[PDB]
Each structure stands twice: as structure tokens, then as C-alpha cells.
Amino acid sequence: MIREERLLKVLRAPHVSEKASTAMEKSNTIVLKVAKDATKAEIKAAVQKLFEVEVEVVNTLVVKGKVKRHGQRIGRRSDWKKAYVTLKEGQNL
Amino acid sequence: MKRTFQPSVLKRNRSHGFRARMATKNGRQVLARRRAKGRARLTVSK
Amino acid sequence: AVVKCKPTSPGRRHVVKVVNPELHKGKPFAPLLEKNSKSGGRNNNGRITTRHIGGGHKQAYRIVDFKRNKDGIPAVVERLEYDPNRSANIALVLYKDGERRYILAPKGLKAGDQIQSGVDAAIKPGNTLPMRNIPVGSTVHNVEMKPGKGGQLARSAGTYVQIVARDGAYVTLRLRSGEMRKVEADCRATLGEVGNAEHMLRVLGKAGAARWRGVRPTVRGTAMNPVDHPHGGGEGRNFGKHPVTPWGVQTKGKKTRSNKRTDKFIVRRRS
RNA sequence: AGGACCGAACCGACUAAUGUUGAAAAAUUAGCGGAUGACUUGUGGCUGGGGGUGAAAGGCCAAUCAAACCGGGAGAUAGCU
RNA sequence: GCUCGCCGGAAGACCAAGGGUUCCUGUCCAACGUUAAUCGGGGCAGGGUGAGUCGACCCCUAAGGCGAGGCCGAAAGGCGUAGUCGAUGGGAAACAGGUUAAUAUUCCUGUACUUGGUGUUACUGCGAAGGGGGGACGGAGAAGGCUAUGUUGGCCGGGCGACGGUUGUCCCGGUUUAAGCGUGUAGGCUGGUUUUCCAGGCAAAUCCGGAAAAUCAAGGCUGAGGCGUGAUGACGAGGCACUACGGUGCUGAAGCAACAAAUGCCCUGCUUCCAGGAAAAGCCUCUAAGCAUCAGGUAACAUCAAAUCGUACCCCAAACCGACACAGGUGGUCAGGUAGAGAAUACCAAGGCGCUUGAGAGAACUCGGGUGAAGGAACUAGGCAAAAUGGUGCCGUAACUUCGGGAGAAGGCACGCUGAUAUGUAGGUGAGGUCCCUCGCGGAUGGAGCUGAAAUCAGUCGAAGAUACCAGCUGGCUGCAACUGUUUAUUAAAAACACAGCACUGUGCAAACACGAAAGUGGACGUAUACGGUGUGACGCCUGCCCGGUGCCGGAAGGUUAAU
Ligand SMILES: [Mg+2]
Ligand SMILES: [Mg+2]
Ligand SMILES: [Mg+2]
Ligand SMILES: [Mg+2]
Ligand SMILES: [Mg+2]
Ligand SMILES: [Mg+2]
Ligand SMILES: [Mg+2]
Ligand SMILES: [Mg+2]
Ligand SMILES: [Mg+2]
Ligand SMILES: [Mg+2]
Ligand SMILES: [Mg+2]
Ligand SMILES: [Mg+2]
Ligand SMILES: [Mg+2]
Ligand SMILES: [Mg+2]
Ligand SMILES: [Mg+2]
Ligand SMILES: [Mg+2]
Ligand SMILES: [Mg+2]
Ligand SMILES: [Mg+2]
Ligand SMILES: [Mg+2]
Ligand SMILES: [Mg+2]
Ligand SMILES: [Mg+2]
Ligand SMILES: [Mg+2]
Ligand SMILES: [Mg+2]
Ligand SMILES: [Mg+2]
Ligand SMILES: [Mg+2]
Ligand SMILES: [Mg+2]
Ligand SMILES: [Mg+2]
Ligand SMILES: [Mg+2]
Ligand SMILES: [Mg+2]
Ligand SMILES: [Mg+2]
Ligand SMILES: [Mg+2]
Ligand SMILES: [Mg+2]
Ligand SMILES: [Mg+2]
Ligand SMILES: [Mg+2]
Ligand SMILES: [Mg+2]
Ligand SMILES: [Mg+2]
Ligand SMILES: [Mg+2]
Ligand SMILES: [Mg+2]
Ligand SMILES: [Mg+2]
Ligand SMILES: [Mg+2]
Ligand SMILES: [Mg+2]
Ligand SMILES: [Mg+2]
Ligand SMILES: [Mg+2]
Ligand SMILES: [Mg+2]
Ligand SMILES: [Mg+2]
Ligand SMILES: [Mg+2]
Ligand SMILES: [Mg+2]
């Protein structure tokens, strides 16, 4: 499920928002941006080694990047992958 | 009333798609001409 | 039995139908069925090559034994069935060794009767053997044109062939067309007539009925415009053509047989 | 039982008014015909231009088809305006 | 915020297709919005789409596509074998509740299920690209059992009324609970078990098929719903606290019965007909090559795994197709109350809306409606348009007829409400009780309660009882086409096309014919009771004469006659 070079590249950033803050208070779940091609297993291992906490389950979705016009031309933001990573009850960080 | 364009992505891609152009000598010439013209979109794609 | 319908509606008044209570109700013998793909009369170019074909009921194909060469092993008729693929009926026969087959149902044949094929089978309706061993004068059906190739002649309901002569390695047959034809005597034939002669007494009674059978409308040439058919248009009803095919060939009277390769088996043409 | 009867959905399109720089490049309202059948409809497939398809009207083949559309021969030719 | 009005088999809700951020929140208003705009599907920023069991992918095939070699073709290419793709069809498994500003069968709570790997343990013949089974199949119709759902009663909470009455036979509301698990019911199909033998199932078979004995009468398979459990729970009017007045918290009564009842389910059934109604895999079983103390198979418990992509929002439309925030077009699903045959229609519920210029005025004329003295087709090409008819039941109904029809011919009578028969009837449903029982979801008996049309008699209100919406005008002579159908999408629906029926004519199967320089294919897995072409056009009574012309069929002697 892992090789350390890959695990280090798989988690990109914390994602911040009311939904993500609540998901932590209410459900001990942390919300992340992960590599696009990341799999739930990679995400789980990665979180477990690097942030050194135990993982219950990982859920993931893919966000479509918004388009923005510009007179006659469009620009397009990038799709990315969101990960809802639930920590085990004995909460950490 | 009912108009002539009734969409279907599946049928769009099967008639006009990249792979359909590539399947015949003449469709591959459609792509050649388009590339020579320097078109941004060779075919309607994803 | 052929039965007239009462005129409880105009499309029923003229219906006359062939109803045969000897025929199995419900489903055929599954192991002898194949798929049957409708064509609309179009060929492998997608073009209509034979007109007027289309729609009509779905049909499974029954595997009929035209060769009848399970020699020596007797068999009994279990039941007669309806076959949508042909005007004749068929019999489900059971061989002594457990095998089942379908055969064309000859006239008179019925559940219980015993059939058999081979160079020595009894001369009896439903039995098959090379015509060199069927007495001249007899009446046969499902006749082979080449040895072991399978029956091709006189299969349609009510049809039959008569062996009028045998000489050398060939028999001479009076086909149902009236034609006198030579076929080599090792060809197989089945004693009897094909069953269901009352077939030709049906009256469809309405247009829908021909549609159920996959026959689409014929449009008369004279009812078209010149560009479409040599039979042209006119101005009111007009004709004045010599009558032709849509393709400009003389319909009515022009012979179109042209096969020097087989001329020599034809003793006398139909009249 | 029935290409049966009356009648919504569904399919059609006989009459009239309106509209005609329209609400609409063919409709709306009131009525009308078929409605278990040769019915109707979704998805996908096949047939290609002197060619298709046509229960046949020269109908239909992407809003003008007695020969589609696009590109080319191409600045066709025009004793005409 | 209070009222008013509109839709309500939709103008509500939910899918698919198609779109693609239009979704939620903040902020802004130039342009877009047919007006203003603080508002918006507009600008800007930020947020938002969470799955083993919902879909895709995946396994399987249909039409059809592609196609190693191959057949064919000046080249390009056409066709096609093995194969390989291709859903609109087949194939494992999840439900109720709670939650966000915005997702949820995806998060949470509760309760489940499926198929694989690994281990342990007991038992064991395992093995496929093959055999066999199964999957697996039409139309119509009948009607019994059910559920969804509703109605009333009961139960529980609350109410005592802005104006006469309202502690009662009164008013309002609620009375909801899934998958899974257990039970095997109404009902559907079918005899069961053993042994022996065999020209079939490409070899093999313990399986299928066939044959022969023996033996028991009950065996097995399928199966809605109910009941139980799930549920010690969830949901639940309301209550009590707080509140930034948007909310949040805690708590929480009854939660039953009878009757009615689908177009949903039993039902892939049953009955019946002719037009005779996919494939392949998953699945069950059989063996072959093999493997034999291994492997593998079956089971229980344990343990691991179930990736990836979609998931926001619009969806009969302001977000899709229509250049528009366009009266058009767009497949599927759901089906509450009263009246009603109804999915028609009217009024309502849930839910959604008043259609993005308004204010006045109350001329002609135009559009769309209502009423109309006397007359009543005098209008006009023409009753064009209007007006009229319009339900149910019973009585009654001509010529003609192919005996079905014509026929709803025509015409007539009844029709509300109240009481009696009967404080609710015929019928439908069915409890307690009693008794039997191969004891159950059983049978008999019993008739309580519930529900309930229709008739007659008597009475009674109005001008009017099928009172609204809804809902045939009828009859006589005659041309044409038998009929139902089809057609000029967009000025013609007809007498035109088709049609069953009839005739002529070709066609012996490598058929004629047709698409193709060909290969290949349709005809047809058909075979003269068949297939093609042509004309006629139900049926009835019938279909006469002409072969000179033109067309076609047959002929061999003579003349003429090509390349050579
Ligand atoms: Mg996901
Ligand atoms: Mg014409
Ligand atoms: Mg000629
Ligand atoms: Mg009808
Ligand atoms: Mg209309
Ligand atoms: Mg009707
Ligand atoms: Mg299509
Ligand atoms: Mg030139
Ligand atoms: Mg010029
Ligand atoms: Mg935008
Ligand atoms: Mg918004
Ligand atoms: Mg403005
Ligand atoms: Mg916006
Ligand atoms: Mg989860
Ligand atoms: Mg090919
Ligand atoms: Mg090749
Ligand atoms: Mg495949
Ligand atoms: Mg599919
Ligand atoms: Mg939402
Ligand atoms: Mg194991
Ligand atoms: Mg099989
Ligand atoms: Mg059946
Ligand atoms: Mg119920
Ligand atoms: Mg008072
Ligand atoms: Mg039973
Ligand atoms: Mg509460
Ligand atoms: Mg949604
Ligand atoms: Mg919707
Ligand atoms: Mg519609
Ligand atoms: Mg508007
Ligand atoms: Mg619109
Ligand atoms: Mg309505
Ligand atoms: Mg008057
Ligand atoms: Mg008057
Ligand atoms: Mg009068
Ligand atoms: Mg006059
Ligand atoms: Mg006058
Ligand atoms: Mg009129
Ligand atoms: Mg009127
Ligand atoms: Mg009275
Ligand atoms: Mg006249
Ligand atoms: Mg007619
Ligand atoms: Mg027209
Ligand atoms: Mg018209
Ligand atoms: Mg005619
Ligand atoms: Mg004559
Ligand atoms: Mg001649």
C-alpha cells in the first residue's frame, strides 16, 4: 500500500472551511487536499505515518474546478481531490 | 415544435469523434486538414 | 379443420383459417431451437434487395432433419407441432437410443406412428431411403437433389413428387411444378406427401394478417411517377407501356432461366 | 373473439376564428379522427446522392430536394441587365 | 406579516437524456433582466458533491461494428473465419431515523446483508473453453387473495368559541414505524423413492435422454400477504427552559380496531388463441486433461478486503432542443379528500404559483365572451360561424341486410329531499362462544360488530332534481371508395395509395430476382400449397368479339447476314 517516496507526495494541504471545522469538532474527521491520483489506501497510510495518528476510514471526492470568462476567453481552475479522513476516537494532532 | 438538433453524447462521439475520424483514410484526412489549418479543437472531445 | 369466422367485424367477415387440433399447444422442444434474425429483406450492404419484407411476428428456428440418415435405429412420433418457419408441420420423433429430432410431418402421420430410415426401411409413410429402393410409381416428398445433401424438393405443405422412371443410376421425377427431372437414384426421398394440404384454403381476410407474416405493401408501378418506375405516371389513369419490371425488363412472358450447367437433368419443362 | 363500439392519456390533424414586423420561420383557442393495433413510444443500429428510403404525395433524406450539404475544377459560361 | 386569487394525473414531487456550477452564503448593480430594481439563473469572492451493498466500470451477450490469417478488388479499398467489441436486455449485497446555509440509502445513530482472500476446526472427490439443466421469454382474457392507500369508530392531547346555540350523538389534530431475521399462509406446478440396462448428448459422466423391474402413497418445488421479531428503539401533538427572535435545547400522550380498496403484488401464474413469442454469462449439476495423505469441495467461528469514476443544481423546464428569461418540443416514475364510470371534469389537501412595465380612463374600431323583442336560413358559393343535442335505467324502434348489423335508429317515461317497509333492507365482511382436529397462519358451528346499493309507498321545496363542470343533434334521397388503415412534416386527407380477394407471368434451387467490376450477401437456413414481377381490387351477378398494328412466345426450311 506504500513506499515512502509516494506517501510523502500524497497529502497536499489542509482544507479550511466551516464544514471542515465542524467535521473535526463533531466527528474527529480532518479534511484534506490530496494528490489527484491518490487512493483511499495511500491517503490512509500517509496520514498514519506522517501525522502519526490512527485512521478509521477515508472518504474521497473530486472537486470540479470552476470556469471563469474573460471577455471572449475562458479560464479553468484545476479539479482536485478532497479527502475526509476520520481519526479513531482517541483524538490526536 | 421539434427541432433538428437532438443531443446524444454517445452518438455525437460515434459519428464525429476522434476515434471515428481515425478509423478511415478520409477521416484521417479531416484531421490532417484541421491540423494544417491549425484548429484548436480537432474534434469535439471531453 | 378449415373454419369460417362470423362477421362480427368487417375485417373478420372473410377470414377463413386452418385450425388443427392435432398440434401441440405451447412451446417447442428447446434443444432443437436456434435464433432467427429478421432481415427486412436487406443484404450485407444494408440495401433492400427483395422488397415487401418487414415486421411481423418474432420466430425461433426449429432444427429440422432434412437428411434423415440416422439409419437402422427406429423412432416414434411423439407429437406434431406448428413451425412458424414453414407451411408444413413438423413431428417430434424419439429414437430408440434416446435421441430426438424434428422431421417434416407427412400426411396421415401422428403420435404413436413408427418411422425409420436406411437402405432397408419398410415402404411406409414417413420412412426414408435412397430412391433406388423405392418402387417406380410411388409418391415421395423431401427429395434430395444430391446424395446425403439433404432434402430440397417437395417440402411445402401438401406437396409431393412421383417417381415415374428409374434407369441407370438415375430416377426421373415428376415434380409438383409439372417438370420432369432426372436426379441420381442414390438420392434419398421420404414416402408420402407433405402434410397440411388444407393450407391453401386459408383466407387471410384483412391486411393486418399479411403484416403479421412480414409482408409489407406492394405499390403498383402505374401508381408511381416516371422517375421511379418504367410504368410511368400519366394524367388520370394512363398506361400504354409494354409491361416491365421496375428495372425495365419484360415482365409477362420472357423466360429468365439460364443454366446450361443443369439443363441436362431437365427431361421436360413445366407447362 | 374482433385491424369491434363510446371515451381520457398517447398518436393524429377535418373546420373556423385569431395570429401573419407572430407568443410561434407552421402555432393558439373552440370543435375533430384513431385509441388492442397494418397501434404508439424510448435507447442503440443499418441504408448515402443518379444514391437511399417511399401503404407512391416527386414525399422524406438536419427550417427551400425533379437530384442534399461542404470543399475543389472556379475568375464555368453569360451574343443579357 | 395578514389577506385575496391560480394549478393540484399539475403549474406538485422524483428519475433519465441534455446542460455544466446555473447550487449555498456574502457582497455589488454599469451591462444583462423588454420597466424600477436594494432583487436575480447578472458581476466578484468564498463555500458545497463523502458509498462494499445507488449508478458506472466490471462479467454476459442482441441488432450491428471491427477483424490475425483468409477470399476479392487498377491503387484506395470491399467482404469475412477464429476472435473482439457493442445495451436499450441478463448477472452479488442496505434499510429506517437524525443531521448541513448548501451532500446524503454516501456523514451519524440503530439494525442488517453480499462475494472473495487468509486462518482454525470437523467432514469430503476435486477438477472446463466441454455435456446437461437453468437463466429463458408472445398476445388476449378471467378473478380470487392481498398490500399500498382511504373512511369511520375507538384511543390520546387540546378546545367550550367575536353574533342565536354549543359539556355533547360536540369541535380540532394525531393515531407513524424499514430492510433484515423467523414462521411457509391464500394460492401455482409436479407423483415420489431404489435398482438394472443403452446405437443419443463430438471423448467422458455418477448428469440429461431412453428402456425395464421393485415399492410407497405422500414427496418435493414455487409463493403475495399476515403474524412475530427488528423496536429496551426511532418518529410523534404538545409541554417546560432558553434565544441574537432566524432558532436551540430538554421532554414527550395515544399509537388500536373494523370496513372499503388499486391499474401495485401473488402472476415469469391460471385460462385461452395463433401471428407460435432473444442470446450469452452468473448459477446448479456431470465428467475430460489432470491432481491423489497435496490440491480442491462443504460448513461454523474468527479475521482481512470490496479499488476507481459519478453523486452539487435544473430537468415536461427561465438552466435541455427552439438566436430570447420564447404560449412550441422533450422518454420514464408517484397518484391524497369530496362528487364521479373514470387517470374525464369541478372544488380542495400536500406542494407550487399570480406568469418582471405599471397607473388611470371607460370613445370609434378590433379581439374574446354574456343576454336579446318579433321573425326563424329570409344569410351565404355553402347553415361558414353560432345555437342545439348531450347521463343512467326501463319501455320502444322502419326500410334494407352479407343476418353481424342498420341501432344510442326514431320516440317515450322516471330522476332532488324526507320518512316507512327496515331507528340500515338485499347483499358484502365477520368477532366472541361451542365443538372437532393429521394442532394450525386449521376445519366446522355461530352470528355480534362493521359496511351497504337498489325498489315500492307516503310526504315535501323550487320555474327548473342527468340542476354546476361534464356530456350524441336527428331523419330522407343520391355520386364515389367495400371495409380498419396510408399520404403531399409547412395551402390538397380525397374519389388518391394500401388492403384481403382474383388473374397473368417468371422461377427446379448455386432458383428467378435484387445489392455488388469481385469476393460476399439478401431471396431463404425458404423449395412450386414456395419465392419474384405485373395488373385488378371485399362480396354478389358476371367478364362478349378482334392477333391487322405494337409487344411477347414458338419454329426450322429458304433468303440475307459479323468477326474469322
Ligand atoms: Mg465516491
Ligand atoms: Mg401520382
Ligand atoms: Mg421499350
Ligand atoms: Mg377499435
Ligand atoms: Mg386542438
Ligand atoms: Mg374512440
Ligand atoms: Mg433512431
Ligand atoms: Mg476551368
Ligand atoms: Mg462569374
Ligand atoms: Mg457563472
Ligand atoms: Mg442562487
Ligand atoms: Mg434595467
Ligand atoms: Mg449569480
Ligand atoms: Mg463509510
Ligand atoms: Mg469486416
Ligand atoms: Mg488483413
Ligand atoms: Mg464482451
Ligand atoms: Mg443497460
Ligand atoms: Mg438539495
Ligand atoms: Mg477456507
Ligand atoms: Mg451451458
Ligand atoms: Mg402463456
Ligand atoms: Mg391496510
Ligand atoms: Mg355566542
Ligand atoms: Mg396451499
Ligand atoms: Mg419537540
Ligand atoms: Mg440531488
Ligand atoms: Mg426534478
Ligand atoms: Mg408528451
Ligand atoms: Mg418572462
Ligand atoms: Mg418555455
Ligand atoms: Mg384535470
Ligand atoms: Mg332574437
Ligand atoms: Mg323569444
Ligand atoms: Mg321553428
Ligand atoms: Mg337562400
Ligand atoms: Mg340572397
Ligand atoms: Mg358548423
Ligand atoms: Mg356551441
Ligand atoms: Mg312520490
Ligand atoms: Mg350526380
Ligand atoms: Mg376508403
Ligand atoms: Mg400540407
Ligand atoms: Mg389539410
Ligand atoms: Mg385501381
Ligand atoms: Mg376482355
Ligand atoms: Mg422469335
CATH of the domain at B3: 1.10.287.3980
N-to-C CA span, chain C: 32
Number of domains in chain B: 1
**CA nearest to C32, candidates C98, C85, C101, C126:** C101
Residues C222 and C22 sit within 8 Å (Cβ to Cβ): no
In chain C, after which residues does the backbone break, taking C–N over 2.5 angstroms as a break? none
Q: What is the dihedral of CA B4, B6, B10, B11, to 10 degrees?
A: -20
Grid cell listed for A24: 473535526
Expressed in percent and rounded to 5, the helix, strand and coil fractions of chain B are 55, 0, 45
**CA pair distance C157, C173, nearest whole angstrom:** 18
Tell which strand E nucleotides have any atom below 7 Å from a protein Cβ: 17-21, 43-51, 62-66, 76-77, 79-80, 87, 100-102, 106-108, 132-134, 136, 138, 198-200, 209-210, 273-279, 306-311, 320-322, 328-330, 402-404, 482-484, 489, 496-501, 504-516, 520-523, 525-539, 550-554
Enclosing domain of residue B24: 1-46
**CA pair distance C256, C7, nearest whole angstrom:** 44
From the CA of C48, how many Å to the C1' of D53?
Answer: 9
N-to-C CA span, chain B: 30
Residues C110 and C24 sit within 8 Å (Cβ to Cβ): no
From the CA of C18, how many Å to the C1' of E405?
Answer: 27
- Give me the half-sphere count of Cα atoms (radius 13 Å) on the Cβ side of residue C61: 8
Placement of cell 362477421 in the chain: C7
Resolution in A: 2.1
Amino acid sitting at position C90: I
Q: Any residues with CB less than 8 A from the CB of C154 and at least 6 apart, and which? A: C140, C141, C142, C143, C160, C161, C175, C176, C194
Q: Kindly list the distances between the CA atom of residue C77 and the CA atoms of B39, C19, C81, C95, C166, in Å, as whole numbers in the listed order.
A: 74, 20, 11, 9, 31
**CA pair distance C117, C144, nearest whole angstrom:** 14
From the CA of C271, how many Å to the C1' of E206?
Answer: 64
Enclosing domain of residue A47: 1-93
**CA pair distance C13, B44, nearest whole angstrom:** 60
Q: Any residues with CB less than 8 A from the CB of C116 and at least 6 apart, and which? A: C72, C73, C74, C75, C122, C127
Domains detected in chain C: 1-113 (2.40.50.140), 117-194 (no CATH), 195-271 (4.10.950.10)
Q: Is the CB of C226 under 7 A from strand D?
A: yes
- Give me the half-sphere count of Cα atoms (radius 13 Å) on the Cβ side of residue C96: 9
CATH number at residue A81: 3.30.70.330
Amino acid sitting at position A49: K
**CA nearest to C112, candidates C89, C88, C94:** C94
